[PDB]
């Protein structure tokens, strides 16, 4: 159930990170062109933080992004309730 | 219960802020290298604001970050419901 949420999310993060670097290489001046940095990107999106150090410049890139938000937000919204309950039910 | 949420959060903020400045000093050009400024960082993350003035450049830094998001979001999601109920139950 919750390990499902975590995993799905971790999949979404690794999925986006893969696809974004894929989606972004080729474009002169693309920043988002190494999985390692594509990963920090992919987290900082799903959390709806939005620091801005990184992002996609390409269309296909932002399409990736949207998915990453859409599945990554929800799936992070799962682990965020999950640990909200585990603090509640206890205390 | 709610003082638990607040506290836990305040712990998470002070935890991250400590660890990030720790995690970030050593790296030339690191911005996030004084607890005072590491604190504003640590808030602005947990809230999922993401202004971007500050952030980690190091790996270990962003690992800190992730935790700070993951525990800081949830624990801020607690105090955000908490004051959502206290407006509801009253009016």
């Amino acid at each position, epitope marked *: 159930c919750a390990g499902a949420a975590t995993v799905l999310l971790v999949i979404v993060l690794l999925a986006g990170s893969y696809l974004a670097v*894929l989606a972004e290489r080729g474009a002169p001046g693309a920043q988002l062109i190494t999985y390692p940095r594509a990963l920090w990107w992919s987290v900082v999106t799903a959390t709806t933080v939005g620091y801005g150090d990184l992002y996609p410049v390409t269309l296909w890139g932002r399409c990736v992004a949207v998915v990453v938000m859409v599945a990554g937000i929800t799936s992070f919204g799962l682990v965020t309730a999950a640990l909200a309950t585990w603090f509640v039910g206890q205390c | 219960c709610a003082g638990a949420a607040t506290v836990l959060l305040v712990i998470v903020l002070l935890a991250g802020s400590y660890l990030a400045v720790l995690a970030e000093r050593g790296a*030339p050009g690191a911005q996030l290298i004084t607890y005072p400024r590491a604190l504003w960082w640590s808030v602005v993350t947990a809230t999922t604001v993401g202004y971007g003035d500050l952030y980690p450049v190091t790996l270990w830094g962003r690992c800190v970050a992730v935790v700070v998001m993951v525990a800081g979001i949830t624990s801020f999601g607690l105090v955000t419901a908490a004051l959502a109920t206290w407006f509801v139950g009253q009016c």
Partner: antibody
Amino acid sequence: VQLVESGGGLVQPGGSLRLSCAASGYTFTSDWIHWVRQAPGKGLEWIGEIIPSYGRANYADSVKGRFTISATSKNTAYLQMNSLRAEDTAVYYCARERGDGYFDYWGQGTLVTVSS
Amino acid sequence: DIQMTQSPSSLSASVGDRVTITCRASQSIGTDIHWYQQKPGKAPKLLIKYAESISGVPSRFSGSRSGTDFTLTISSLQPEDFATYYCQQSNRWPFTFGQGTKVEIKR
């Protein structure tokens, strides 16, 4: 984990040639092979990358749509070489890069010479 | 495009001496520059990543500094170190190399 590079010797200006980089090592799903060139007495020049996985191949302005990079069965990537100028006279190393952005391993590299 | 500018092209430094090799990126590139030794006729060999040492690379070999100034440094130049030394961006697409710095050994 080393890189084995076939093909390439002499071609006519405007002619063709196909270079070869066979895997021969523990080779992950998600590796780019790259193509770097060295003119005679000259620097390195990045030219092209490809992920054999989704088979998407990116190229330098230098090389624009003159060259093609081809991808998994033989665990090989290839450097199709159309519209050759005198300039492309050079050695051509392939190289693995694990998405991290530096070249861990490097094919022996061949010489492509371009003269009438 | 991103313009790695190594310094100096040539060195004639005596053995065991302190050799240093500079590489100015046109813009801030993070720590996303990687060093490479390339011996005459042979393939580039990677000495430094994120100016972080590689397994088997000798201890003479270190690479630091930021802003736009990356600095590969030979603590005690050795006879086996006559090579040309290359500089590689990662930060922006595409990847670029520096001009290159030849070291020659004095004896």
